[PDB]
Amino acid sequence: IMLNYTKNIRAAAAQISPVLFSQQGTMEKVLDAIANAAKKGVELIVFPETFVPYYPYFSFVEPPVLMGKSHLKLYQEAVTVPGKVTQAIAQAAKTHGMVVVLGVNEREEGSLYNTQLIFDADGALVLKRRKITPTYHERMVWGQGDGAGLRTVDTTVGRLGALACWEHYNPLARYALMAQHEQIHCGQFPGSMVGQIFADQMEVTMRHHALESGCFVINATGWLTAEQKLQITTDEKMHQALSGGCYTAIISPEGKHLCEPIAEGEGLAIADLDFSLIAKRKRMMDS
Prior knowledge:
GO terms for molecular function: nitrilase activity. The protein is of the alpha/beta class. 30% of the residues lie in helices and 24% in strands. The protein has one domain: 4-Layer Sandwich (Nitrilase/N-carbamoyl-D-aminoacid amidohydrolase), CATH 3.60.110. The strands form two sheets. Strands 1, 2, 3, 4, 5, 6 and 12 form a seven-stranded mixed beta sheet that branches. The protein has a five-stranded mixed beta sheet with strand order 7-8-9-10-11, covered by helices on one side.
């Protein structure tokens, strides 16, 4: 629609663990999440970075010379342009009248991308973008998005913006979304990786986003169980590297947590976002 600050919206950030090595298994958890959330009248939900079929932890942890099996596998479980996954989600969204923000390892023509997808409450896919700069180990896996991906979308629940991980340090993206008055910003990070340091950094990064933009921020991060870490490597010495960095959270325009944030295990962070807060913020400063 056009821009309105009278809404009050129930949003959720989902920390979940995927199913290790099954698009379908992970997809069952996603649909379940949506449904559980619908039970509590959630109208917008954000999942972790590239959650489907699973984030590519292998690229962080295996030497390149041995990444082939893991790479192939991921390709086999990766998600097409539009397809089964898209329709399944479009339907959950339509059914529960929910806006859904989903990250996905997209395949196109033997290439992979980190792709953020946004579905409106009518089940329409109203935004598709690719992370612009895969960072570090991600460069072994994903290609680049365009910068034409920096637009917001009007949605049943307001105007949304989305970025992945350190896309948040890219100043073009920040101003792009701010200039378009994004009302609710959706961040996605991988989850269960590097440690406290990464967690502290996410939080600082995303809460500052809220502050500078003066918008709501919602951030989702995956989770791994000890069993799943083994599935990824038998080297227990690596397992610190696959722990921590979890900040599933919902942040007000003043930087406040609107609910207890999640760093461990698996759950929905849920809160009512009162849009008049966005406007009481802007009015309080002058110039």
